A paper describes a structure:
Recently, a Hydra Actinoporin-Like Toxin ([name]) gene family has been found in Hydra magnipapillata and composed of seven paralogs, in which [name], [name]-4, and [name]-7 are secreted as part of venom by Hydra during its prey hunting.
To unveil the structural insights into lipid preference of HALTs protein as compared to sea anemone actinoporins, we have determined the first crystal structure of actinoporin-like toxin, [name] at 1.43 Å resolution with an acetylated lysine residue K76. In the lipid-binding region, the [name] contains a shorter α2 helix and a longer α2-β9 loop due to deletion and subsequently an insertion of five amino acid residues in comparison to the sea anemone actinoporins. However, this motif is not conserved in [name] and it exists as a 140RAG142 motif that contributed to the formation of a four residues type II β turn between β9 and β10. An overlay of [name] with sea anemone actinoporins showed that the shorter β-turn in [name] resulted in the main chain atoms of G142–W144 (equivalent to N147–W149AfFraC) shifted ~ 2 Å towards the β-sandwich core as compared to other sea anemone actinoporins. Structure comparison and molecular docking analysis further revealed that the [name] lipid-binding site may favour sphingolipids with sulfate or phosphate head group more than the sphingomyelin.
Author numbering: 3 to 168
Amino acid sequence: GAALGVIAKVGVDAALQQIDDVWKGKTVRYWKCAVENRSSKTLYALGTTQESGSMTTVFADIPPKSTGVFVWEKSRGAAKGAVGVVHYKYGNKVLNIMASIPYDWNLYKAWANVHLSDHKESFSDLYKGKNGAKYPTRAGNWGEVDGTKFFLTEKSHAEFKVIFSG
């Protein structure tokens, strides 16, 4: 499963562990992600909004009771962060997840956010708390928006965990 981007049965912690065997990477800022689908519907992979860098691994649909796994990396050679929004379809709704790992930790902090709405949300609206999104959650803290729980480690080489239940 890990090589396909999606693992059955396991939750976020176990899924994160399986990433290293199937991903290398050579950038100094990244976030590994696990999206645990405890809902009743498949989360269909819908897109990404690249603020800095990209999703560099396979992007899979997540059936109920599976966990999607992937990595977001800064661009090779950039002194920029790993910063992106990942979108899934949930019925006709859109699940938006965001994590932001800076290059310059002297100037910036690390942040995450989640928002289920009718559309793909911009990075800016997820970082500002606009258009219905909440103010973002600082790394190192459990967040919960509309019953979706999430956590981003405060690391250059981070882990972003999302548990979605509908």
